[PDB]
Design an enzyme around this catalytic site. Structure first.
Site, PDB file in Angstrom:
ATOM      1  N   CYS A 134       8.347 -26.932   2.862  1.00 51.94           N
ATOM      2  CA  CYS A 134       8.854 -25.568   2.767  1.00 51.94           C
ATOM      3  C   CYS A 134       7.749 -24.528   2.602  1.00 51.94           C
ATOM      4  O   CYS A 134       6.970 -24.568   1.645  1.00 51.94           O
ATOM      5  CB  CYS A 134       9.839 -25.457   1.596  1.00 51.94           C
ATOM      6  SG  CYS A 134      10.602 -23.817   1.568  1.00 51.94           S
TER       7      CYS A 134
ATOM      8  N   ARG B  71       8.182 -21.309  -0.430  1.00 52.46           N
ATOM      9  CA  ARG B  71       8.188 -21.640  -1.843  1.00 52.46           C
ATOM     10  C   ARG B  71       7.700 -20.575  -2.824  1.00 52.46           C
ATOM     11  O   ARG B  71       7.828 -20.748  -4.031  1.00 52.46           O
ATOM     12  CB  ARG B  71       7.433 -22.955  -2.060  1.00 52.46           C
ATOM     13  CG  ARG B  71       8.283 -24.197  -1.777  1.00 52.46           C
ATOM     14  CD  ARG B  71       7.478 -25.466  -1.984  1.00 52.46           C
ATOM     15  NE  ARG B  71       6.507 -25.680  -0.914  1.00 52.46           N
ATOM     16  CZ  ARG B  71       5.544 -26.597  -0.954  1.00 52.46           C
ATOM     17  NH1 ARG B  71       5.423 -27.382  -2.017  1.00 52.46           N
ATOM     18  NH2 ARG B  71       4.717 -26.742   0.073  1.00 52.46           N
TER      19      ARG B  71
ATOM     20  N   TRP C 160      16.628 -17.721   3.495  1.00 49.95           N
ATOM     21  CA  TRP C 160      16.713 -16.844   4.658  1.00 49.95           C
ATOM     22  C   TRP C 160      15.740 -17.428   5.675  1.00 49.95           C
ATOM     23  O   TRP C 160      14.859 -18.204   5.315  1.00 49.95           O
ATOM     24  CB  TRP C 160      16.399 -15.375   4.311  1.00 49.95           C
ATOM     25  CG  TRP C 160      15.120 -15.108   3.589  1.00 49.95           C
ATOM     26  CD1 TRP C 160      13.862 -15.023   4.132  1.00 49.95           C
ATOM     27  CD2 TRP C 160      14.967 -14.839   2.187  1.00 49.95           C
ATOM     28  NE1 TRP C 160      12.945 -14.711   3.154  1.00 49.95           N
ATOM     29  CE2 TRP C 160      13.598 -14.594   1.952  1.00 49.95           C
ATOM     30  CE3 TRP C 160      15.865 -14.786   1.107  1.00 49.95           C
ATOM     31  CZ2 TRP C 160      13.096 -14.295   0.677  1.00 49.95           C
ATOM     32  CZ3 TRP C 160      15.363 -14.488  -0.168  1.00 49.95           C
ATOM     33  CH2 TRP C 160      13.992 -14.247  -0.366  1.00 49.95           C
TER      34      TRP C 160
ATOM     35  N   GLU D  82      11.856 -20.242  13.368  1.00 48.49           N
ATOM     36  CA  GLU D  82      12.878 -21.280  13.329  1.00 48.49           C
ATOM     37  C   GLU D  82      13.922 -21.000  14.414  1.00 48.49           C
ATOM     38  O   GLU D  82      14.443 -21.915  15.068  1.00 48.49           O
ATOM     39  CB  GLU D  82      13.554 -21.297  11.959  1.00 48.49           C
ATOM     40  CG  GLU D  82      12.686 -21.802  10.826  1.00 48.49           C
ATOM     41  CD  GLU D  82      13.413 -21.737   9.498  1.00 48.49           C
ATOM     42  OE1 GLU D  82      13.368 -20.670   8.846  1.00 48.49           O
ATOM     43  OE2 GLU D  82      14.041 -22.750   9.118  1.00 48.49           O
TER      44      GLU D  82
HETATM   45  C1  HEM Z   1      13.683 -18.014   0.679  1.00 51.40           C
HETATM   46  C2  HEM Z   1      13.520 -18.296   2.007  1.00 51.40           C
HETATM   47  C3  HEM Z   1      13.091 -19.518   2.539  1.00 51.40           C
HETATM   48  C4  HEM Z   1      12.362 -19.627   3.677  1.00 51.40           C
HETATM   49  C5  HEM Z   1      11.900 -18.482   4.593  1.00 51.40           C
HETATM   50  C6  HEM Z   1      12.099 -21.036   3.890  1.00 51.40           C
HETATM   51  C7  HEM Z   1      11.562 -21.523   5.078  1.00 51.40           C
HETATM   52  C8  HEM Z   1      11.534 -22.855   5.435  1.00 51.40           C
HETATM   53  C9  HEM Z   1      11.068 -23.352   6.710  1.00 51.40           C
HETATM   54  C10 HEM Z   1      10.377 -22.557   7.827  1.00 51.40           C
HETATM   55  C11 HEM Z   1      11.297 -24.683   6.686  1.00 51.40           C
HETATM   56  C12 HEM Z   1      11.152 -25.686   7.846  1.00 51.40           C
HETATM   57  C13 HEM Z   1      12.494 -25.891   8.550  1.00 51.40           C
HETATM   58  C14 HEM Z   1      12.406 -26.828   9.743  1.00 51.40           C
HETATM   59  O1  HEM Z   1      11.398 -26.758  10.483  1.00 51.40           O
HETATM   60  O2  HEM Z   1      13.356 -27.618   9.950  1.00 51.40           O
HETATM   61  C15 HEM Z   1      11.800 -25.026   5.379  1.00 51.40           C
HETATM   62  C16 HEM Z   1      12.038 -26.343   4.937  1.00 51.40           C
HETATM   63  C17 HEM Z   1      12.528 -26.685   3.677  1.00 51.40           C
HETATM   64  N1  HEM Z   1      12.879 -25.755   2.692  1.00 51.40           N
HETATM   65 FE1  HEM Z   1      12.532 -23.807   2.679  1.00 51.40          FE
HETATM   66  N2  HEM Z   1      12.666 -21.825   2.891  1.00 51.40           N
HETATM   67  C18 HEM Z   1      13.315 -20.890   2.076  1.00 51.40           C
HETATM   68  C19 HEM Z   1      14.232 -21.253   1.089  1.00 51.40           C
HETATM   69  C20 HEM Z   1      14.538 -22.556   0.705  1.00 51.40           C
HETATM   70  C21 HEM Z   1      15.395 -22.857  -0.419  1.00 51.40           C
HETATM   71  C22 HEM Z   1      16.230 -21.860  -1.227  1.00 51.40           C
HETATM   72  C23 HEM Z   1      15.267 -24.214  -0.644  1.00 51.40           C
HETATM   73  C24 HEM Z   1      15.903 -25.004  -1.616  1.00 51.40           C
HETATM   74  C25 HEM Z   1      16.279 -24.648  -2.878  1.00 51.40           C
HETATM   75  C26 HEM Z   1      14.354 -24.710   0.374  1.00 51.40           C
HETATM   76  C27 HEM Z   1      14.096 -26.064   0.593  1.00 51.40           C
HETATM   77  C28 HEM Z   1      13.427 -26.553   1.698  1.00 51.40           C
HETATM   78  C29 HEM Z   1      13.336 -27.960   2.029  1.00 51.40           C
HETATM   79  C30 HEM Z   1      13.771 -29.182   1.211  1.00 51.40           C
HETATM   80  C31 HEM Z   1      12.781 -28.043   3.243  1.00 51.40           C
HETATM   81  C32 HEM Z   1      12.456 -29.337   4.005  1.00 51.40           C
HETATM   82  C33 HEM Z   1      13.661 -29.974   4.690  1.00 51.40           C
HETATM   83  C34 HEM Z   1      13.279 -31.153   5.571  1.00 51.40           C
HETATM   84  O3  HEM Z   1      12.554 -32.054   5.090  1.00 51.40           O
HETATM   85  O4  HEM Z   1      13.709 -31.178   6.744  1.00 51.40           O
HETATM   86  N3  HEM Z   1      13.895 -23.691   1.201  1.00 51.40           N
HETATM   87  N4  HEM Z   1      11.954 -23.892   4.599  1.00 51.40           N
END
Ligand code: HEM
Ligand code: HEM
Ligand code: AP4
Ligand code: AP4
Ligand code: CAC
Ligand code: CAC
Ligand code: ZN
EC number: 1.14.13.39
Lengths: 416, 414
Positions: free
Chosen positions: A120, A123, A292, A297
Site C-alpha cells: 500500500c 499508508r 480512495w 489504478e
Molecule cells: C487512503 C487512500 C488509499 C490509497 C490511495 C491507497 C492506494 C493503494 C494502492 C495504489 C494499492 C495497490 C492496489 C493494486 O495494485 O491492486 C493499495 C493496496 C493495498 N492497500 Fe492501500 N490505499 C489507501 C487506503 C487503504 C486502506 C484504508 C487500507 C486498509 C485499511 C489499505 C490497505 C491496502 C492493502 C492491504 C493493499 C494490498 C492488497 C493486495 O495485497 O492486493 N489501503 N493501496
C-alpha cells in the site's frame, strides 16, 4: 557498519538501516538461493482454511505478542493492566480455545494492519481510519446493512473517508463470515459466444456465480454486480446495492472532446472485501476496507491492462496515432491521456483522487516518519512504484525492504 | 523447492528448475526480501593478494569445464576428461589455471545469458569476443579499447562485443578501467554546489583532472580514459573524436527541441564490472551492445540526479507545471523518449524501444524455459522506467538467482 539491512535512496544519496525487520515473526518466500519477491501470490502468508481449532500455544504466543504491541502503543508496557490483560487472554484461550479483543484493541489492530501492508502506497493516512465494529452481526441480511452504512460513510458524497467494517472472527466448529466479491463495487464480466468478454474480464467468475445464485444479468460494459454475502454455515445470499449508494464518475478529457463519447466511467469507492484481517492470531475472514483511488489504478491498470478493459488501442486510434509500430509510442501517449482524463473527471465531479506523483511523494514522507517511529517500513517495491512513469516518481530511486509484520491483511482462499 | 511462476496477462504457468543450479547466495532470507537493492553489502569481489583455495577454485573450474564440453556435446569425450586433468594439474601446482580461447568465448556468452538485469539477452548468442589477455600495459589496453569501439560502433550498425583483459592474480594488482563506461560525459561541480554536465560522472571527472586532464566546460564533453595496469598509477588517454559516434537530439514535430542542444553517444559500454568464469576473475572486460531508448530518454536525461531536463521541456511545451495532476512530467517524458527514438533512427544508429525490447525478452524467457528450465530475471530492472504495465514483462512473475559465468560488481580501484 550496523548489522541491519542498509537502505539507499539513489536520487538523494541518503542512507538508512532497517531495524524493524528484526521484529518479523512470519517468513516470506525468499531464500539466499533465489528471490521470489516479484510473485503476486506466493504460498506463504496464504491463509488457507485451517478448520480444526489452532494450537493453543501458537495462538497464545501470537495473542501475547499482540497485547504487548497494544500496551506499548499506549505506553503501559509492564503495568498491572498489561499483565492482567495477558492473564485474562490466556485464561480465555484456556477454556474456550480462543479469545476476544476489547473495542480499543480492535481499532489499534486494524490501523496497524493497514500500517503493515507492504503493497500500500497510501499508508501516510494509516492513522486516519474509521473502524466500524460489526462483531455483533449475526445474519447475511445484517451484513448487507453494515456494508451499505460503510459505503455511505466512506463515500460521503465524493469527499471520501477511509474505513473498515469488522465482522465476527473465525470461530472453531462454526462457519466463516465471507463476502464472495473481491471488492464492494465490481463491474460485471459477460463471457461472449465468440469467447471474448463484455465488461470487466477480471470479474468473469464472480459474475457467473451471481447468476448461478439468482442474479438476472444485464449486457453492458459497466453493470454493477450484486453482493454475494455469506453468514456462518448458510449458503451465500444475494443483495443488490441501491444505485444511489454507488457513486460513479463518467470519464471525459480536458481538451480531447471526443473522449466523453467513449462512454467510459468508474466508481468512486475502492473497497477490498475478500482479504483476511489477522490480529493476535484471531482471523477476521470478513472485514472490508476502503480508502480512495490513486489515478493509475483506474487510468492505467483497470482501463489499459490487456486482460482488463484494454482500451489503449481504441483511444490511440481516436488520437490518430501510428498503432502499427511500437517506436511511435502510441501506447505511452494514449495511456498518459487516459490517466489525465481520470484525474480531470474525478476533480470535476468533486470526488477524491490522488495522482501517482502526489501519492508517491507522500509515501516518501511516510517512510521518513516510520524510520523515526519504528526504525523502518516494510515495502513491496514492485507494487509501490506506479504502472506508468516509474522513474519519474521518487519511490523508484528508493530501495525497499520487504517483510511480514502482524497485525496484517492477508489473502485467503475463495469460499467456493 | 521449485517455484511456480505465473504470467498474469495470459494466465500461463511455468516451474523454474534452473534456480537449483545456483551455488552463490543473494541478499534475501526468509525474514526479509532485499531484492530491490542495487548493490550487495559485500557480495562484491574482495582483494586477490593470496591464491584462492584449491578446493573451491577446482570445483568452480571443473563445473565450468563441464558446462563447456556439454555445450559442444562432447560431454564425456577424452578431450573433456583431459581438460579436467589439465585444470587439476595446473591448480594443484600453481594455485590457479588459464582458459582456452574457445572456453573463454563460451564463458563470456554464458555470463551475459545469466545476467538477471539484462533485458536484451535474446541476443546472448551473438557476441564478438576480443581476447586481450596478452596485454601488459595501459597503452596496450588503450589500443585494444579503440579497436573494440571501432568494431562495435560500425558506423551506426552497432554490434555486441566484449574485450577481455588479463585475469586477476594473487601476486599482484588488477588491470582496471577506472571509468564506469567507455564513453561518459563530464560532470563539473560548479561553485554554487551546481553541476555542469552529467552529475553521475562528477567523481571520475575530478580524478581525470587530478591526473592531468585539461577540462572543458560544456554539458557534453566526452571524458578521457583512465586505464590502470597492475600496481601502476592509472594513465590518461583521450579517445579519437572520430571513434566516438554521437547523435544530436531533435523531435519529429517539435521544431524547438533541437534548439536544446541535447545529444547522446551511440555506444553503451560498461567497463567497471568483473567477469567471473570458472573461478577465474577478469577485473577488466568492457562489454557493449546497443541502447534501449529509455536508458537515454528516461533515466539519463530525466532522472533528477542526472541531466534533469523534464521541466525545461515542459516549459517549452508550455505545460502546466503548477500541479502534478496535469501530468506535465509524464507528457514531457514521452516526447523526450520520442525525440531519442527519432534522432537515433534518423542518424542510422541502432536503438530499440522499450516495447520491442521487452517483447523480445518475453520470447527469450520462453526459449530459456525449454533450454534450461528457467531464466534468472530481476523484475525491478527488467521493467522499463516508464509505461511499466504497458509492457508484457510487468505482468510476468520472475525468479532471481545467481548463475556462473557471471558479471559482478567490484570495488572502485581508487
Ligand atoms: C487512503 C487512500 C488509499 C490509497 C490511495 C491507497 C492506494 C493503494 C494502492 C495504489 C494499492 C495497490 C492496489 C493494486 O495494485 O491492486 C493499495 C493496496 C493495498 N492497500 Fe492501500 N490505499 C489507501 C487506503 C487503504 C486502506 C484504508 C487500507 C486498509 C485499511 C489499505 C490497505 C491496502 C492493502 C492491504 C493493499 C494490498 C492488497 C493486495 O495485497 O492486493 N489501503 N493501496
Ligand atoms: C544488444 C543490446 C543490449 C541491450 C538492448 C541491453 C539492454 C540492457 C538494459 C536496458 C540494461 C539496464 C541498464 C541500466 O539500467 O543501467 C542492461 C543491463 C545489463 N546488460 Fe544488457 N543489453 C544489451 C547487450 C548487453 C551485452 C552485450 C552484455 C554483455 C556481454 C550485456 C550485459 C548486461 C549486464 C551485465 C547488465 C547489468 C549491468 C549493471 O548491473 O549495471 N548487455 N542491458
Ligand atoms: N500496484 C501493483 N503493482 C504490481 C502488481 C499489481 O497487481 N499492483 N502486479 C501485477 O499486476 O502483475 C505483477 C505485479 C507487479 N506489480
Ligand atoms: N533498469 C534499472 N532499473 C532499476 C534501477 C536501475 O538502475 N536500472 N535502480 C534505480 O535507479 O533505483 C533503484 C533500482 C530500481 N530499478
Ligand atoms: C473519438 As473516436 C475517433
Ligand atoms: C522551446 As524552449 C522554450
Ligand atoms: Zn527477495
Amino acid at each position: 557498519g550496523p548489522k541491519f539491512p542498509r537502505v539507499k535512496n539513489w536520487e538523494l544519496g541518503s542512507i538508512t538501516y532497517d531495524t524493524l525487520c528484526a521484529q518479523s515473526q512470519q517468513d516470506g518466500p525468499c531464500t539466499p538461493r533465489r528471490c521470489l519477491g516479484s510473485l503476486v501470490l506466493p504460498r506463504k502468508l496464504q491463509t488457507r482454511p485451517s478448520p480444526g481449532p489452532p494450537p493453543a500455544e501458537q495462538l497464545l504466543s501470537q495473542a501475547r505478542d499482540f497485547i504487548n504491541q497494544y500496551y506499548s502503543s499506549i505506553k503501559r508496557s509492564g503495568s498491572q493492566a498489561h499483565e492482567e490483560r495477558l492473564q485474562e487472554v490466556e485464561a480465555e484461550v484456556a477454556s474456550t480455545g480462543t479469545y476476544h479483543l476489547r473495542e480499543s484493541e480492535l481499532v489499534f489492530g486494524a490501523k496497524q494492519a493497514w500500517r503493515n501492508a507492504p503493497r500500500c502506497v497510501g499508508r501516510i493516512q494509516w492513522g486516519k481510519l474509521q473502524v466500524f465494529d460489526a462483531r455483533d452481526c449475526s445474519s447475511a441480511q445484517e451484513m448487507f446493512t453494515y456494508i451499505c452504512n460503510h459505503i455511505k460513510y466512506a463515500t460521503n458524497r465524493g469527499n471520501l473517508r477511509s474505513a473498515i467494517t469488522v465482522f465476527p472472527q473465525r470461530a472453531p466448529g462454526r462457519g466463516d463470515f465471507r463476502i464472495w466479491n473481491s471488492q464492494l463495487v465490481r463491474y460485471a464480466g459477460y463471457r461472449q459466444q465468440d469467447g471474448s468478454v463484455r465488461g470487466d474480464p477480471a470479474n468473469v467468475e464472480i459474475t457467473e456465480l451471481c447468476i448461478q445464485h439468482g442474479w438476472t444479468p444485464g449486457n453492458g460494459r459497466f453493470d454493477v454486480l450484486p453482493l454475494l454475502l455469506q453468514a456462518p454455515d448458510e449458503a451465500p445470499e444475494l443483495f443488490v446495492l441501491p444505485p444511489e449508494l454507488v457513486l460513479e464518475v463518467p470519464l471525459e478529457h480536458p481538451t480531447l472532446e471526443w473522449f466523453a463519447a467513449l462512454g467510459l466511467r468508474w466508481y468512486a469507492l475502492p473497497a477490498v472485501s475478500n482479504m483476511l484481517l489477522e490480529i493476535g492470531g484471531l482471523e477476521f475472514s470478513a472485514a472490508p476496507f476502503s480508502g480512495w483511488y490513486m489515478s493509475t489504478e483506474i487510468g492505467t491498470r483497470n482501463l489499459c491492462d490487456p486482460h482488463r478493459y484494454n482500451i489503449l488501442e481504441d483511444v490511440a486510434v481516436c488520437m490518430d496515432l501510428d498503432t502499427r509500430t511500437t517506436s511511435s509510442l502510441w501506447k505511452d501517449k494514449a495511456a498518459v491521456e487516459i490517466n489525465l482524463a481520470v484525474l480531470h473527471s474525478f476533480q470535476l465531479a468533486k470526488v477524491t483522487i490522488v495522482d501517482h506523483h502526489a501519492a508517491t511523494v507522500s509515501f516518501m514522507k511516510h517512510l521518513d516518519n516510520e524510520q523515526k517511529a519504528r526504525g523502518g517500513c516494510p515495502a513491496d517495491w514492485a507494487w509501490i512504484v506506479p504502472p506508468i512513469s516509474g522513474s519519474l516518481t521518487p519511490v523508484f530511486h528508493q530501495e525497499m525492504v520487504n517483510y511480514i509484520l502482524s497485525p496484517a491483511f492477508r489473502y485467503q482462499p475463495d469460499p467456493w
